[PDB]
Design a protein around this ligand. Structure first.
Ligand code: VO4
Length: 297
């Protein structure tokens, strides 16, 4: 049981050892396509690649490679696409993937510039009047509106397939204060943001998988997905004790390497899930408590 275990681990100060054990037991699968010489400029990081078996394939005849993985959580019945922050040459691929996979939301957990370096291309328009056209993939992207809060921004984008002129609404959920290799300010702040993604409909099974990224797409993205999946699992059963956080993370790591980069992110994942359990088990008022504690104004 997560809460009991949580305090056992805190008591011993053994989060590094627990986290290390998950690293040691995690799956190892080939990333042959990612390592092909022609894909070198499609990878942001040399050591972060999608497994071949779970990689997202673009629907183009030329080169179908993107650094993106489908995390298909069978028992929870939820899927996510975890991907790196697009590069200047992969922004067209990124939006092509959003289109072909029928995603409704994009969750971005990083800033474009972090610690003085460019962690992510400016892949969406910052101004209504300056829309973006990705000529390589024949897509057009327009900012429709923006709702700026203290630590996150929600954007309403319109994505158009120029070949067919069909248009779709994409919701962009942008957490702007979550540092690389860091943890959110509080369980409340993280959960307030997670429930706004859930309260967008973007995670619904009638849509394609939500796209989740930060810079590499494994650490903050892993944390976000682990908490969400764990809450969903106990929601389906209405049974918080049936959820094994470490086994869920190991299951997720069969689909993308390196999910959760630090032991404190794992520890934070426990915190977020334990706190979110109060909502799942019937205390609806906690949701407004999180919003207050998050100080989004
Ligand atoms: O850009 V990350 O170090 O949260 O995978």
């Amino acid at each position: 049981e997560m809460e009991k275990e949580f305090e056992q681990i805190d008591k011993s100060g053994s989060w590094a050892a627990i986290y290390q054990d998950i690293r040691h037991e995690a799956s190892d699968f080939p990333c042959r396509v990612a390592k092909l010489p022609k894909n070198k400029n499609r990878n942001r990081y040399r050591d972060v690649s999608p497994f071949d078996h779970s990689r997202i394939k673009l629907h183009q005849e030329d080169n179908d490679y993107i650094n993106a993985s489908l995390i298909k959580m069978e028992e929870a019945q939820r899927s996510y696409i975890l991907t790196q922050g697009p590069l200047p040459n992969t922004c067209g691929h990124f939006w092509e993937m959003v289109w072909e996979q029928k995603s409704r939301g994009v969750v971005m957990l990083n800033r474009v510039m972090e610690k003085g370096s460019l962690k992510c291309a400016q892949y969406w328009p910052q101004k209504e009047e300056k829309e973006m056209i990705f000529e390589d993939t024949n897509l057009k992207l327009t900012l429709i509106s923006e709702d700026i809060k203290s630590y996150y921004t929600v954007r309403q984008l319109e994505l158009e397939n120029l070949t067919t002129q069909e248009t779709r609404e994409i919701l962009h959920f942008h957490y702007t204060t979550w540092a690389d290799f860091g943890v959110p300010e509080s369980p409340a702040s993280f959960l307030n943001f997670l429930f706004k993604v859930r309260e967008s409909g973007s995670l619904s099974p009638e849509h394609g998988p939500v796209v989740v990224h930060c810079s590499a797409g494994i650490g903050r993205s892993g944390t976000f997905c682990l908490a969400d999946t764990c809450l969903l699992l106990m929601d389906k059963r209405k049974d918080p004790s049936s959820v094994d956080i470490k086994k869920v993370l190991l299951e997720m790591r069969k689909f993308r390497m390196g999910l959760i980069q630090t032991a404190d992110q794992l520890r934070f994942s426990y915190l977020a899930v334990i706190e979110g359990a109060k909502f799942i088990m019937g205390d609806s008022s906690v949701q407004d408590q999180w919003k207050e504690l998050s100080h989004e104004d």
